[PDB]
Design a protein around this ligand. Sequence first.
Ligand SMILES: C[S@@+](CC[C@H](N)C(=O)[O-])C[C@H]1O[C@@H](n2cnc3c(N)ncnc32)[C@H](O)[C@@H]1O
Length: 214
Amino acid sequence: MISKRLELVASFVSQGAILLDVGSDHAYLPIELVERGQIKSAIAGEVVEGPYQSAVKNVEAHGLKEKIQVRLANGLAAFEETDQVSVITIAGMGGRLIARILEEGLGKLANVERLILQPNNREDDLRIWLQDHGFQIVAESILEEAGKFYEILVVEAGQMKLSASDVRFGPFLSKEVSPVFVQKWQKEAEKLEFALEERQVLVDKIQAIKEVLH
Ligand SMILES: C[S@@+](CC[C@H](N)C(=O)[O-])C[C@H]1O[C@@H](n2cnc3c(N)ncnc32)[C@H](O)[C@@H]1O
């Protein structure tokens, strides 16, 4: 049933957690996770009525009223420190909105063990942000689904000084340099050459891709 992307995200969720899933369409992720006993309880939070309603309903349907709360809230407003959240997933958004959300709610994060994040784009910018604000990446996955590529970033409390390669391609994605890693950046590399002395932004970009794949 559950999407293959949403599958990965779930797989980094600390066994026993209390989850907050920001932008939980349809509550699919907290729902599966509650169902397989991998988490204790959850909060699905959504920012507009459409999705909020959808999540409310699906939770009833799976009769999980007393295991998942659904809140119409914007980003981290969705919880307070009393909810005692251990893990937050934030999936299916732009890199920079993910940053803005973490940004506008940075306060709340001190007692949060882990942060599972699937940006849609702007993966680099998030990394710059995450570095600059006292977060370190502990784990990274990539996957293909139905044409589209999807980076997942697992994060904790910490310092990290990243290479400019590591911001662009990812600390862990370019360690174990997988096949899915390779088409992404390949596909992107020809996308570039296709385009090709501002015609120079590209050269080095292209060169960087050549380099991390080599
Ligand atoms: C591409 S969907 C992904 C939903 C789910 N996390 C997933 O990846 O499968 C983006 C969803 O994020 C929701 N969202 C919830 N809270 C948000 C917030 N606080 N700021 C921006 N988008 C938010 C939007 O309403 C929308 O339903």
